[PDB]
Amino acid sequence: VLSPADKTNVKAAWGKVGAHAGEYGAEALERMFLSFPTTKTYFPHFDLSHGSAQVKGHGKKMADALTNAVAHVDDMPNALSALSDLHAHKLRVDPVNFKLLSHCLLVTLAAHLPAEFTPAVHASLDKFLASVSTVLTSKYR
Amino acid sequence: VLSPADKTNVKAAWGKVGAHAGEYGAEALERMFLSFPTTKTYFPHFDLSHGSAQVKGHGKKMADALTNAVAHVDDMPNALSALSDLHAHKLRVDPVNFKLLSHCLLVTLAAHLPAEFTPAVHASLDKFLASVSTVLTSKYR
Amino acid sequence: VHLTPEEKSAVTALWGKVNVDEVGGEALGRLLVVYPWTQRFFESFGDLSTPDAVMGNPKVKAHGKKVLGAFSDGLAHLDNLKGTFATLSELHCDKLHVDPENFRLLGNVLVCVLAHHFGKEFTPPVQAAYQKVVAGVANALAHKYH
Amino acid sequence: VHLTPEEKSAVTALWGKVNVDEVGGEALGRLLVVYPWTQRFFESFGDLSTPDAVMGNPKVKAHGKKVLGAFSDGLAHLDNLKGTFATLSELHCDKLHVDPENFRLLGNVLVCVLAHHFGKEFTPPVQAAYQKVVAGVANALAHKYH
Numbered sequence: 001v002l003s004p005a006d007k008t009n010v011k012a013a014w015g016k017v018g019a020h021a022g023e024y025g026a027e028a029l030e031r032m033f034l035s036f037p038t039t040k041t042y043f044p045h046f047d048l049s050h051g052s053a054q055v056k057g058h059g060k061k062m063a064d065a066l067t068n069a070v071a072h073v074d075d076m077p078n079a080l081s082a083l084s085d086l087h088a089h090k091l092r093v094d095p096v097n098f099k100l101l102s103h104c105l106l107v108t109l110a111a112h113l114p115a116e117f118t119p120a121v122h123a124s125l126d127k128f129l130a131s132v133s134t135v136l137t138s139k140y141r
Numbered sequence: 142v143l144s145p146a147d148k149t150n151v152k153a154a155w156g157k158v159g160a161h162a163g164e165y166g167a168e169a170l171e172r173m174f175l176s177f178p179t180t181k182t183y184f185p186h187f188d189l190s191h192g193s194a195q196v197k198g199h200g201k202k203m204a205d206a207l208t209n210a211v212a213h214v215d216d217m218p219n220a221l222s223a224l225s226d227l228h229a230h231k232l233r234v235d236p237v238n239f240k241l242l243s244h245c246l247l248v249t250l251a252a253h254l255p256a257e258f259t260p261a262v263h264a265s266l267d268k269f270l271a272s273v274s275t276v277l278t279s280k281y282r
Numbered sequence: 283v284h285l286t287p288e289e290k291s292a293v294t295a296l297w298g299k300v301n302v303d304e305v306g307g308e309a310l311g312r313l314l315v316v317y318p319w320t321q322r323f324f325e326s327f328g329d330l331s332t333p334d335a336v337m338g339n340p341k342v343k344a345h346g347k348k349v350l351g352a353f354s355d356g357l358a359h360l361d362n363l364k365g366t367f368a369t370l371s372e373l374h375c376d377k378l379h380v381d382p383e384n385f386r387l388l389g390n391v392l393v394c395v396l397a398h399h400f401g402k403e404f405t406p407p408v409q410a411a412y413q414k415v416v417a418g419v420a421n422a423l424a425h426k427y428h
Numbered sequence: 429v430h431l432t433p434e435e436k437s438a439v440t441a442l443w444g445k446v447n448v449d450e451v452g453g454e455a456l457g458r459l460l461v462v463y464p465w466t467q468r469f470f471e472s473f474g475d476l477s478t479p480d481a482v483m484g485n486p487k488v489k490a491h492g493k494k495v496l497g498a499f500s501d502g503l504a505h506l507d508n509l510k511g512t513f514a515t516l517s518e519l520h521c522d523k524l525h526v527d528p529e530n531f532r533l534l535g536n537v538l539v540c541v542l543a544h545h546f547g548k549e550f551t552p553p554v555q556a557a558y559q560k561v562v563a564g565v566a567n568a569l570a571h572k573y574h
């Protein structure tokens with residue numbers, strides 16, 4: 001369960017990410033690809049090199065999914081439902097990989113939002129990303 | 142999300158555990174204490190030796206919480222709400238420990254229910270226990 | 283590894299009773315059914331669409347036999363688990379890119395299969411000795427990451 | 429450990445810029461706030477009731493300094509991380525009974541602190557070199573379990 005404080009911090013930090021949301025998503029993915037190379041196997045057809053249009057394209061799509069989760073934070077399961085089906089059924093993404101990407105998303109915000117990344121906001125962001133990850137792994141059949 | 146098949150398998154297996162539920166709970170705890178000794182530190186005041194009345198007493202209380210979760214499988218968060226507060230706030234139980242106990246609970250059923258522990262029932266039981274564990278770790282503040 | 287004489291005794295005696303032609307495939311099949319994402323690594327194995335379809339798959343059974351082969355090799359070498367599994371580490375880590383957490387999962391699944399087949403004989407102390415073994419193997423198999 | 433010259437270069441240069449009197453306590457404090465169960469191990473530290481109360485706790489700051497001390501000791505010894513941390517392994521594993529997963533958590537928290545303090549300078553390849561380091565340390569610190 002996400003606390004009213006948590007929703008407030010996540011909203012505030014996403015508001016401060018602003019129009020960089022997409023670029024931030026791209027950077028999180030690259031951080032993940034470099035730091036945890038096992039994750040690369042889900043994207044064999046992507047060019048994963050620095051400045052890849054596909055990575056960038058994916059960074060925006062992933063970031064948009066997160067803002068949609070934020071905007072509907074009280075019913076994430078419904079909002080992320082199609083995405084949950086995709087990640088668990090079709091792609092068969094390992095639940096561990098959600099922890100690795102979540103960490104890298106935290107690192108990315110930390111690296112871009114010096115004022116916003118307080119211990120509290122960090123804690124709230126972490127629970128948000130765990131919540132999103134729980135929904136995205138809810139459909140293992 | 143637990144599937145209608147999952148609810149059916151879990152119900153069936155708990156029905157077959159029958160009145161051994163308490164004894165099974167005691168055995169799961171001992172299995173956990175022996176296999177993963179780190180978990181013992183939450184029970185410094187228990188006698189953890191074989192045949193401990195306190196372990197047994199706890200085995201029944203834990204087993205009763207699980208049957209209550211089964212009996213209300215469609216609203217576990219509400220049913221396990223007080224328990225969630227206890228485990229996360231008061232005891233500060235490490236989320237990892239829920240995986241260790243869940244595994245040992247699976248081992249215990251496996252060891253007592255040869256006919257019931259089919260690959261499907263094993264899968265459904267595993268998701269049930271992950272679900273219960275998610276609720277019990279929902280209140281980290 | 284931290285195996286005592288009594289722990290070594292529990293493991294070996296039980297392991298002598300293990301049907302090494304089936305327990306290996308019983309465990310892999312269960313992994314595929316319980317943790318369905320692992321099926322990603324076995325897309326070439328054929329019908330994996332139902333639990334019955336997975337357990338009755340001869341390629342799964344054949345491949346689990348090989349898996350169990352490696353555990354038995356681990357059991358004769360708890361002094362050097364790192365070196366015994368080094369080749370398998372290279373393969374799973376550098377070639378396959380299997381997240382090592384899955385190594386612990388299959389180990390736990392094996393333990394469940396052992397409990398299931400042996401019942402009251404797989405006692406809590408017997409389980410304890412076996413958790414040290416599968417942990418040991420999962421960690422050696424994951425050396426190429428560490 | 430698998431550190432390349434370029435990875436060694438990224439780590440050491442950044443580490444030279446680290447305020448070793450504060451970054452250690454910044455990381456421990458964050459661990460206590462983000463993963464509150466870890467507070468179980470620091471019940472003697474006093475006021476841990478709010479984020480501000482945790483970060484401003486002189487015992488947390490003092491203790492994190494010691495923690496960061498150990499990392500810096502790790503950075504001079506990536507050849508023998510196992511032996512450097514052996515005493516700390518005994519303490520955390522046999523005496524404290526801290527689940528090793530928490531070692532990876534604090535490592536990840538450190539990485540977040542580094543990103544936070546260094547910004548654009550903590551590049552994705554710089555993060556990569558540091559994940560190998562904290563992984564290496566978490567695994568050595570957990571040797572007494574393996």
Ligand code: HEM
Nearest residue numbers: 039042043061062065066083087091093097098101132133
């Ligand atoms: C917060 C966590 C995540 C979010 C919000 C997210 C969101 C998304 C979105 C919005 C898409 C696009 C769907 C479409 O274009 O139809 C997608 C696709 C995809 N995702 Fe993620 N995802 C997450 C975690 C992960 C992780 C951890 C992995 C693997 C390590 C992963 C692997 C993939 C792959 C392989 C695709 C398909 C890309 C392609 O084939 O073009 N996702 N995800």
Ligand code: HEM
Nearest residue numbers: 180183184202203206207224228232234238239242273274
């Ligand atoms: C399916 C998972 C679990 C269930 C259903 C469960 C259920 C319960 C129940 C019903 C109680 C009794 C509450 C009371 O008597 O007021 C309890 C207490 C307790 N639990 Fe669990 N629990 C679970 C997991 C865990 C784990 C994984 C740990 C630690 C490794 C743990 C540590 C404790 C402790 C230390 C107590 C208090 C015992 C005492 O001080 O007398 N629990 N739990």
Ligand code: HEM
Nearest residue numbers: 320323324348349352353378380384385388389419420423
């Ligand atoms: C304790 C854990 C494990 C052990 C002991 C083990 C053992 C083995 C063995 C003995 C082989 C045969 C290699 C050969 O033919 O030379 C193999 C191959 C293979 N393993 Fe495993 N394995 C483990 C975990 C896993 C897991 C968890 C996965 C995936 C989820 C996996 C995926 C594969 C695949 C895809 C192959 C075939 C690759 C090829 O033929 O090149 N392994 N493993």
Ligand code: HEM
Nearest residue numbers: 466469470494495498499524526530531534535565566569
């Ligand atoms: C990479 C991870 C870690 C490192 C490098 C580390 C390092 C250290 C160091 C250098 C000390 C001081 C020992 C001394 O005074 O001789 C210490 C003590 C301590 N650590 Fe950590 N630690 C780590 C993880 C953890 C975690 C995750 C926890 C708990 C959640 C923890 C709990 C404690 C406690 C309670 C003490 C004080 C115990 C005593 O004074 O006997 N440690 N650690």
